[PDB]
Amino acid sequence: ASRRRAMKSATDNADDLIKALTLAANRERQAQITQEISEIVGGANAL
Amino acid sequence: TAGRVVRITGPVVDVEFPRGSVPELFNALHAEITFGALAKTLTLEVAQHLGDSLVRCISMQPTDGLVRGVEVTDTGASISVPVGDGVKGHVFNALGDCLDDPGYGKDFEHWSIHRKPPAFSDLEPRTEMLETGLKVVDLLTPYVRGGKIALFGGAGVGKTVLIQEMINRIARNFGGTSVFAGVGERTREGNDLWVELADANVLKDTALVFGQMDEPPGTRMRVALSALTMAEFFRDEQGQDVLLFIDNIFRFTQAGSEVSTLLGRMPSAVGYQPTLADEMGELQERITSTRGRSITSMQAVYVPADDYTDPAPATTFAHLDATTELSRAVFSKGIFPAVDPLASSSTI
Amino acid sequence: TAGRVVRITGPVVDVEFPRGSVPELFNALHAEITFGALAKTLTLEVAQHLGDSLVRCISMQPTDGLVRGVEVTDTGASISVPVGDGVKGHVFNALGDCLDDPGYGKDFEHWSIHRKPPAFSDLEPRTEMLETGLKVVDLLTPYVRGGKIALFGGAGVGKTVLIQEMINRIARNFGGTSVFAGVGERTREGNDLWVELADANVLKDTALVFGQMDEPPGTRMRVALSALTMAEFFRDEQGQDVLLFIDNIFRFTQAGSEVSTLLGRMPSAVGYQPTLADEMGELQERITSTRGRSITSMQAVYVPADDYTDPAPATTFAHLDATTELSRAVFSKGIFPAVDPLASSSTILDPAIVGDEHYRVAQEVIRILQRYKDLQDIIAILGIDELSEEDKQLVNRARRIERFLSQNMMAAEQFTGQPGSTVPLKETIEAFDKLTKGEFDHLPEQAFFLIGGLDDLAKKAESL
Amino acid sequence: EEIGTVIDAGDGIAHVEGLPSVMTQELLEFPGGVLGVALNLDEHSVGAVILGEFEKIEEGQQVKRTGEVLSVPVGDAFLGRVVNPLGQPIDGQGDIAAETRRALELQAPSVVQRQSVSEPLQTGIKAIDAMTPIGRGQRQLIIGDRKTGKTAVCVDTILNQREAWLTGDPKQQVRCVYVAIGQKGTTIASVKRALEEGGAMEYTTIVAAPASDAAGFKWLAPYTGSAIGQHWMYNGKHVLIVFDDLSKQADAYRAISLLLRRPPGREAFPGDVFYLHSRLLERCAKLSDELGGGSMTGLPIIETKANDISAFIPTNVISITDGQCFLESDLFNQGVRPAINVGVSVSRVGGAAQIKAMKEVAGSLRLDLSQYRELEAFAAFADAASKAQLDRGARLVELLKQPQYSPLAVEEQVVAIFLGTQGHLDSVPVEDVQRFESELLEHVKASHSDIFDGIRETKKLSEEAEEKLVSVINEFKKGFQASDGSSVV
Amino acid sequence: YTGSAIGQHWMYNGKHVLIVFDDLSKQADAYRAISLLLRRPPGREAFPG
Amino acid sequence: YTGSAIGQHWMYNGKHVLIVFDDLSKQADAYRAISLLLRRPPGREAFPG
Amino acid sequence: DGQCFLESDLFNQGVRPAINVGVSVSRVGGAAQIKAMKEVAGSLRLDLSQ
Ligand SMILES: Nc1ncnc2c1ncn2[C@@H]1O[C@H](COP(=O)(O)OP(=O)(O)OP(=O)(O)O)[C@@H](O)[C@H]1O
Ligand SMILES: Nc1ncnc2c1ncn2[C@@H]1O[C@H](COP(=O)(O)OP(=O)(O)O)[C@@H](O)[C@H]1O
Ligand SMILES: [Mg+2]
Ligand SMILES: [Mg+2]
């Protein structure tokens, strides 16, 4: 019984960690996209 | 009194005009291609004044075969579309030409598409719950007269059945009409939908407008504008409720961004035009409820890889009122009207 | 003799001069606004040359209501600050005139604000153990008498309370003259500080200079120079101990970035300007103590968007000798000092200077904290059951040490209403030695929370 | 007679030639009746950005100057009116006659002109007055995410001033200003109707900027929103102002800057946003006795995505402002309508201006709430003392729930706080608490209404009054019945 | 383009044709290069309009 | 460069030398700043060619 | 022709040199060393990495 309870708690602890990691990855990807597009447009219009 | 073409790079075109005759913004012009086998006429709209009698404009159909120094004429008025009680039961394009029968509707009455939303005083400080014969949706996610309803998750679970259900329900219970607009359409899907509707005997009391997926940018906005023009004409003069079906709200924004990039203005965060919010606000505030009449609407949306924080869905969700979800398990269980009650919610 | 304004695009102004009368690269010019509602007299500082007897300049006042073709005149010398003995006990702005009495201080002797740093020969390293009644600073990052100290913070992390604590701890017993500067803050704390020093009987000794966030960026780059001129005069001639307080240098960096963008120059990276490090070093190399003169300085810096990788704080980081950092996580944990031990360092921490007693205790403490931080992930995902006995006890005493490291504040009487305390160093050393050896295993965790001395901890032990 | 002509007509920007004598930020007239502002000058041309509608203007048009700096009309007739940011009556209710003009760009008072804040500003939401005291002249921040119910808080705060207005004392009367940037017209109509229902519309002025307009109005709304309050400042009155959302105008400023060809910074945001936000939030001040006194209490609202408090704009605003209040959508979905997280919400300046009776009727509820939170966190997987503590915490948490509108006054607020804090309702089941907490109050309004008089006069609770009300509630709990509730006896 | 042009002649004569494109990413790269060589405003990833 | 020149001069007479560089990142940033002040196009991540 | 990597984690851990044997190499290798050191030392780097 204790094993059942602990394993359930472990799953309920893992899911939200997955969600937070997904959010962080998404914001990082958006920041990267903005960074390279800004760099390329600046290099292009610097001429 | 007639201009000339100076630059022809890309879809964009630069036009030179005599002094004192430069057309205003959002004005129509015609230019005819007569060289080679591929002969046709093109329509252009004024996009920006460059000064010194130079006007930058965007084409509507491909600019292949054009020659420098050709002659061009201006209509003098904005893009016009024919409206009336006889326009239903016929397929139309963005420019108003009737694909089913050319020359149709030439004697109708034409209206412009750039129109102002109503005044502040005409707004009604009330929320009226729109009711229908479906007990599936009334108990959990009630609809709102004049609001917006989100629908996504088709996946071939029978959303066309829902569309025709709404069409016949508004035809019978409320004595209304229906207008369907396609922004990016696969030709086979549109043809199949037309055939199915013809077999269902509901082409009457239903107008259809299509914009093909393979088309130069510029149509993907004007199709929605024309559909809204027809819908508001039905609402006002006839004084009878209408329902607007608009699909593919997503690549409307992509077409706008594409045009903005073509004009050459600097982009914004995550590569978007800097004025998307104003355009989406104009389109959303186009519809409203007044004089006891209303325009409800159902829209299909597509999230960019499940990132709800992307600018496009974030801007879109600022105007929705209710969400409907199409599930792929309830119908496998045998429940023919497919919904996901747990995944659907309403603010009402 | 007289110039013409040719273009006004905001704070920056371009002016043309007749042949032979172009001014120097640093100078002051005057102009006037003749409109009835906003009549003023504005001062311009020359910034750069453009050829054809045309020069680009910045302004110290808002440019609203100005029209092209107005007349400008040249002073012939850089801007000046009224400096001398007795200016203490008053508040001033960037230009120099007193806020209370407009005519006060007009007769004093005036200096310049642009001065070369001292020669290399007179520089001399110094290491002295400054003492403040705080556990975290004494144990981990001891301060120095003649060095420069910095406080790195985020947003809403409690740094201002730390500044009030430091001024209360140090300014009481100081025999010298102190000086405070404000760069881009909000006036509420200005009034709070004024009224709090009014009844502290110390305002007579200190002079204040204020530049706030409501002013244009042009004025947000000069108050530091004015305060530095005051400190330089008090240090060079009178030969007295000098103390300096500076807040939000990051605002100075932001103002520099904005004015650079307005001037017109290709941005460097992450939307910044070239030669930021040159300006930073040029400012930071004047706060030095020679072999026969002394000066101490404490500064506050704000981390934008909680990004420690940003160039603006990264460049300034290698000009200090004792730094402290605050974290959002510890703030959420409930530790009000909110100092992270693993990201703060001091140069004088070595057995030669501090001694052999502190070194081993500090090393053991940092090792325990590092091990706990390493194991925290597996702790979070599953729990504490999977670990071995020794790791379990290490985690337990690591939690005890972390909770104990917080101390009851002195300036929190406005909020908590619980009087603070100060602790001698030897008591801290003995308490931490006992904690590392682990003689407080059976005590509950809640006792180790804002207690100060270990005697109060023993008293609170039976309170539960 | 100084007339110019347009050389180039961009989308949102125009360029005018000629017109030598023109002031900075001067107002320009166009043949279509639209107005522009000039911000960049040159030896050859002058740039300008158009306000309102711009599709009318085009190349070759005639331009005339007005000879006045950027200014807004202001008077005392604006009470109970609806207006656009420029200053024309948007509604057809009639015309407005002003008394003077006010420039938008005026410097804030210096450090010597300020004054400490000591006068409390009451609000109907009992869940924050006991939790996070507020005082007039002190700024506060409301931050959250979509669909959490914050405009309701704003309108309740606006509505709560009915008694103060009806008192008639000029020192007690408080005016109000409301602004709306990029909002749907239906919401504006609904909030106007709701204010009209409460009879508070006469002493309020609302500035409307719809979501379908150009960027200029979204940029200029806060300036003209605060100018009227600034004018009323120097006559000794007290002013309250609410900013519907600052993110939208920041986005509009980013759009106009990008249209003006300026290099960007972080996520295309220029570095000038901090300057303008600082200007707006520093215009407010608590004047001293020399100038006459007054207040400019402002309550801006900021929305966040997925509870991103570590973003750019939220951190900037948090740094600028004094305090903040946080709304959690997860708690909102649980039916807790006044969903404010006590964990991070805090005020620094508040507490001195709070009523002493209010300060002593609520005995450190913060530690009790945090203890209840940690206790339920521990008991999630799993002691009589702990059971009693969690029961008391549950009762206290459920007490703070409030229905829509119904702004409570100070007397019943402190009465309910005393009832909860003392330890009452321990035997009362939670399900029947709400109605109970109302009905008893109504009886107190009927019998023994003199108790409220003492609180109104001396602003403290006396021994005789408290024992009398204790006896009254002891004689009332037996008179109330529930499906599963019985008197403690 | 020439592959589809070849196929269309048979496809307009009641005959069934199957056409395979080995790759399309390289086509996009070639178009991007030829656009960048002359003056073309670049969007995301320097791709042309 | 001056340290390198001194080392070379002591090299060519047959001696042995050892040179220590404080940091190369700072001089790289100085080069970036001086190049960027001059009107030259920026390179990858703001570092010129 | 060779790199030495110092990480703050090892310095904190209690290793005063604070160098990791995983990613530290030398092109010349045993050629530079005196022969006696070459026989005494052996392949200690590989054993440490293992
Ligand atoms: N105290 C309350 N009692 C009852 N209902 C409430 C209460 N507070 C909020 N609500 C309900 O919650 C919703 C609040 O909508 P509201 O317009 O205030 O949203 P919001 O979070 O301010 O966001 P937005 O500005 O996007 O609309 C409404 O449906 C309202 O009826
Ligand atoms: N030791 C403490 N005791 C009580 N409150 C504290 C303490 N430290 C910080 N705070 C809280 O943190 C806030 C400090 O904000 P702060 O970080 O100084 O703002 P800013 O960064 O703008 O200067 C105060 O409102 C205060 O309530
Ligand atoms: Mg702080
Ligand atoms: Mg709302």
Span between the terminal Cα atoms of chain D, in Å: 90
Q: What top-level class would CATH report for the domain D73-357? A: alpha beta
Question: Which run of H or of E encompasses D166?
Answer: helix D162-167
Q: What top-level class would CATH report for the domain D1-72? A: mainly beta
This structure's resolution (Å) is: 3.5
Beta bridge partners of C153: C302
User: Which of D39, D41, D113, D260 to substitute to test the interface with C, most C CBs within 10 Å?
Assistant: D41
Contact by Cβ (8 Å): D87, D120: no
CATH 3.40.50.11540 fits D358-479, yes or no: no
Interface of F with A in 17-46 (CB under 8 A): 41-46
Ramachandran angles phi, psi of D427, nearest 5°? -85, -15
Q: How many CB atoms lie within 10 A of CB A9?
A: 14
CA B115, CA D95: separation in Å to the nearest integer?
Answer: 27
**Pairing between β-strand B109-112 and β-strand B293-300 as defined by DSSP bridges:** unpaired
Interface check for D322 against chain B (CB to CB < 8 A): the answer is no
Contact by Cβ (8 Å): D248, D182: yes
Cα dihedral angle (C405, C408, C412, C417), rounded to 10 degrees?
A: 140
Residue G27 known to be catalytic: yes
Contact by Cβ (8 Å): C278, C225: no
Residue of chain A whose alpha carbon sits nearest to that of C270? A35
Amino acid found at B277:
A
CA C29, CA C7: separation in Å to the nearest integer?
Answer: 16
Closest CA to C460 of C390, C411, C403, C375: C403
Question: Which run of H or of E encompasses C213?
Answer: none
Question: Which run of H or of E encompasses C255?
Answer: helix C249-263
Q: Is the CB of C412 under 6 A from ligand 2?
A: yes
CB contact (8 A) between residue A34 and residue B307 = no
* Active-site residue identified among G27, G28, G35, G50: G27
Touching chains, F (3+ CB pairs < 8 A): A, C
CA B23 and chain centroid, separation: 26
Q: Percent helix, strand, coil in chain C (nearest 5)?
A: 35, 20, 45
Contacts of A46 in chain F (CB under 8 A): 41-42
Residue of chain E whose alpha carbon sits nearest to that of A40? E46
Residue whose structure tokens are 């509950």:
C444
Angstrom CA distances, G16 to B7, C364, C456, G8, G13, stand at 71, 14, 37, 10, 9
C339 by Cβ neighbours in 10 Å (0-12 / 13-18 / 19+) ranks as buried
Q: Percent helix, strand, coil in chain D (nearest 5)?
A: 35, 20, 45
Q: Provide the 3-class DSSP secondary structure of residue D171.
A: coil
Radius of gyration of chain E (CA): 16
Angstrom CA distances, D11 to B24, B130, B265, D51, stand at 12, 40, 11, 12
Contact by Cβ (8 Å): F33, F47: no
Contact by Cβ (8 Å): C89, C205: yes
Which residue ranges make up each domain of chain C? Answer: 1-78, 80-347, 349-464
Span between the terminal Cα atoms of chain B, in Å: 57
Contacts of E42 in chain A (CB under 8 A): 40-41, 44
Contact by Cβ (8 Å): B174, B212: no
CA of C159 to the centre of ligand 3 (A): 4
Which residues line ion ligand 3, judged by CB < 5 Å? C 159-160
Radius of gyration of chain D (CA): 26
Angstrom CA distances, D312 to C114, C156, C257, C305, D151, stand at 35, 14, 17, 6, 23
Amino acid found at D464:
E
Contacts of A34 in chain E (CB under 8 A): none
What is the 3-state secondary structure of chain B? CCEEEEECCCCEEEEECCCCCCCCCCCEEEEEECCCCCCEEEEEEEEEEEECCEEEEEECCCCCCCCCCCEEEECCCCCEEEECCCCCCCEECCCCCECCCCCCCCCCEEEECCCCCCCCCCCCCCCCEECCCCHHHHCCCCEECCCEEEEECCCCCCHHHHHHHHHHHHHHCCCCEEEEEEEEECHHHHHHHHHHHHHHCCCCCCEEEEEECCCCCCHHHHHHHHHHHHHHHHHHHHCCCEEEEECCCHHHHHHHHHHHHHHCCCCECCCECCCHHHHHHHHHHHCCEECCEEEEEEEECCCCCCCCCCHHHHHHCCCCCEEEECCCCCCCCCCCCCCCCCCCCECC
CA of C457 to the centre of ligand 2 (A): 25
Angstrom CA distances, B152 to B148, B179, B301, B344, C431, stand at 13, 19, 6, 11, 64
Residue C337 is classified by DSSP as: S
Contact by Cβ (8 Å): B313, B328: no
- Concatenating the DSSP letter of every residue in D33-85 gives S-EEEEEEE-SS-EEEEE-S--SS--TT-EEEEEEEESEEEE-STTTTEEE-S
Which residue ranges make up each domain of chain D? Answer: 1-72, 73-357, 358-479
Amino acid found at A20:
A
Span between the terminal Cα atoms of chain C, in Å: 83
Residues 6+ apart with CB under 8 A from C205: C88, C89, C177, C178
Q: Of A27, A33, A45, which has the smallest distance from its Cβ to B271's Cβ?
A: A33
CA B307, CA B328: separation in Å to the nearest integer?
Answer: 22
CA B106, CA C193: separation in Å to the nearest integer?
Answer: 80
CA C432, CA C440: separation in Å to the nearest integer?
Answer: 11
CA of C287 to the centre of ligand 2 (A): 29
Which residue out of D125, D301, D331, D404 has the highest number of ligand 1 atoms within 8 Å of its CB and is therefore the one to mutate?
D404
- Tokens standing for F35? 């190049």
Amino acid found at D451:
I
CA C464, CA C127: separation in Å to the nearest integer?
Answer: 44
